[PDB]
Amino acid sequence: MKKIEAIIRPFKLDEVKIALVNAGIVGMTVSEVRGFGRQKGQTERYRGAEYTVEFLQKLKLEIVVEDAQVDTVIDKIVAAARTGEIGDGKIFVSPVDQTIRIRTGEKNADAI
Amino acid sequence: MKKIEAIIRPFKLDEVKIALVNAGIVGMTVSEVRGFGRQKGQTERYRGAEYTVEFLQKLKLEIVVEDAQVDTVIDKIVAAARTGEIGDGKIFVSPVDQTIRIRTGEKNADAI
Amino acid sequence: MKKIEAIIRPFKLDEVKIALVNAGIVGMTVSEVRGFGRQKGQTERYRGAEYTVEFLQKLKLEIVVEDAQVDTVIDKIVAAARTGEIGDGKIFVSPVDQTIRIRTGEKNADAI
Ligand code: NI
Ligand code: NI
Numbered sequence A, B, C: 001m002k003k004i005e006a007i008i009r010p011f012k013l014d015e016v017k018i019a020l021v022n023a024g025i026v027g028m029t030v031s032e033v034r035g036f037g038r039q040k041g042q043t044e045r046y047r048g049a050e051y052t053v054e055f056l057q058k059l060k061l062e063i064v065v066e067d068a069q070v071d072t073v074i075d076k077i078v079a080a081a082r083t084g085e086i087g088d089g090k091i092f093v094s095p096v097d098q099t100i101r102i103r104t105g106e107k108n109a110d111a112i
């Protein structure tokens, strides 16, 4: 298995969430986090001519999927979370060796 | 080392927490997360004949242990977090290459 | 890439945060968590002669960096988060196989 983590803009939550559920992906978990981001400053020159780096609210999405589904999940998240502006966030993929379903004790494990 | 992550029902927190501490496991960290879960609907047919999938509160438990202790910790969590009903949650095991104790600088690392 | 996670005392947040940003490290994310810690008890014998283990607030810092930067980031965190007293926290290093920048779709991946 693989772990997919994504840091996104808070207002994009429902879009990403619904897009995944509609694609048949429902095992995501979301947590509130803080990170650095840009904030436009006042100017007459042009958009973004000046700005500051502030500590602000973001959301962390976590999903554990089979190795074969990784690319598909990434494509969905990228498509739904993108705005085209700086600060859209990043996706990190890491390994998960095994999963255990608490209710039944069922196990799913990677082989050496 | 290995990282053990578990997504459990909020009301099971104290049971799981105390069970682990009493077994000599005290390095757990807990965070609030949201995820999808079922919610029984009204009916006269039978329990669960109808229901909805909602975005609700859950808890994420994280513990880093030696490879040898993994199975033991999993057994404790499963035993304490289980209710037998759908939505009990899952446990994910992943790798941790090294740990550093901030106070002393002491290190513990895996070998290639 | 590698994932660096650190569990620190809440009041050390700004010190660690500023130290990292000033060193050119700005991709950190922070989340609130709870974990066990000591609490000094009343006594006339000596500092720490008695105490209790309580469930209290801590902060989890997460940063994904290139393998080459790991030691540098760890040194900064240790230096800034240390108080010298028990309960300073720990740092865990784990693998990250790939990163995807949501805005552009740009990818960075490890080789087999
Ligand atoms: Ni895996
Ligand atoms: Ni390990």
Ligand code: NI
Binding pocket: C001, C002, C095, C096, C097, C098, C110
């Ligand atoms: Ni890597």
